[PDB]
């Protein structure tokens with residue numbers, strides 16, 4: 001139907017047409033006495049990945065300390081010590097494609113060497129353009145998220161599309177094939193609560209760019225802003241964003257609560273004729 | 275905006291524009307040794323109504339044995355003994371409008387005398403046309419649900435709209451004012467699982483009739499058909515139907531899980547600009 005290619009992920013292949021793809025969020029739980037690779041640290045990660053797999057995740061998204069939600073000031077040297085053991089163990093023990101959640105070229109490169117299949121970049125190849133070359137080099141899919149260092153829009157959606165296209169250009173100029181490009185509206189980033197809702201409301205506009213769209217709204221602050229609920233009480237809110245996202249044509253959803261969101265995605269898929 | 279009238283419910287008034295209205299389902303839990311009105315029976319009902327009120331319900335829908343989901347063969351004499359004490363106590367103790375879930379004229383009449391504000395008719399005034407006269411008489415809103423004794427459609431949606439209009443005509447010919455008419459697509463009734471999904475997918479078509487729409491998909495079988503989950507494990511599925519319903523412009527949702535569905539409705543409302 002809509003997509004005449006599959007998303008190629010090394011040993012794994014993701015069909016973009018038959019169902020909404022669920023990307024499970026795995027954040028590192030660092031050990032306080034080591035720089036990475038410890039049993040408890042990695043075993044925690046591996047167990048969470050198996051769990052999310054058993055609950056219906058199609059992709060495991062792995063993030064070190066430098067990325068969301070903590071945004072630690074940490075070197076690539078430090079960061080690699082931490083994320084590489086996780087990617088090695090998860091890729092070995094869990095048979096799903098792995099995305100590396102980083103905006104750093106060198107981390108992306110070593111993550112892929114370690115076994116990751118997809119690059120997920122919260123800065124859309126703008127913070128470190130060479131990440132697009134890494135991606136082109138290894139021929140992996142790259143997720144380009146909308147982001148910017150400010151909330152001074154003239155027109156939110158038009159600007160979002162312009163910004164994303166600037167990301168696409170960096171990517172293609174490095175050699176990234178169209179079929180390896182995925183976009184993300186960057187909900188919860190560089191947007192007021194009202195702009196996040198407005199982005200949700202007009203999400204279907206991203207579709208004119210001709211690339212698969214991943215939605216990542218899970219547990220985010222704007223949901224708290226609407227419901228006045230803390231992060232642990234945001235299942236219902238996340239769900240609403242997921243269903244609306246799917247209705248507006250998104251191919252992936254990046255979520256913490258895989259069990260619940262997979263059920264909801266599956267029901268949405270059935271209703272919209274996916 | 276969309277509605278230039280409020281829904282008038284005696285002492286209560288429901289705004290159709292500012293938020294999706296939540297209708298909480300209260301089914302009778304009959305005592306086995308009495309025909310109605312017992313303390314345990316009514317106290318159970320009253321407690322469930324307060325609970326649903328505290329959880330964000332805007333309307334309490336009360337059903338006796340003859341209606342869904344049990345469809346008991348019971349006389350109006352018997353049925354009144356059962357539903358009247360519930361309406362009396364709930365209306366007294368819970369300050370929300372009450373809908374009576376019946377297709378029987380005489381039950382509707384006495385329910386309204388007892389304190390109910392809205393008639394909810396699963397047969398769309400077709401089983402007992404005089405229910406429309408009761409409604410006109412007392413000047414209460416009536417919910418006309420799509421239903422039929424068969425699943426032999428030529429074209430599902432066109433037929434649904436035709437059938438609903440046949441209901442509208444009965445209602446208006448009895449004297450029911452347009453502002454007192456609400457429609458319901460009758461999901462889960464007289465439809466295959468596939469037709470229920472198709473009705474969900476094309477729900478926005480009901481809007482051309484110019485009347486508020488109530489959606490009632492809660493825990494229904496087709497959700498089980500899609501997810502392969504039993505009735506207690508259908509929160510996520512119900513939610514998906516609720517969000518899609520709201521996106522397609524429905525004014526009410528009739529649900530069992532008020533807490534969860536209110537949160538989800540509230541988030542949807544915020545995103546679509548309601």
Ligand SMILES: Nc1noc2ccc(C(F)(F)F)cc12
Nearest residue numbers: 235236239260509510513534
């Ligand atoms: N299966 C559940 N247990 O607790 C829940 C809270 C919300 C939801 C929702 F709304 F996301 F479906 C599902 C569940």
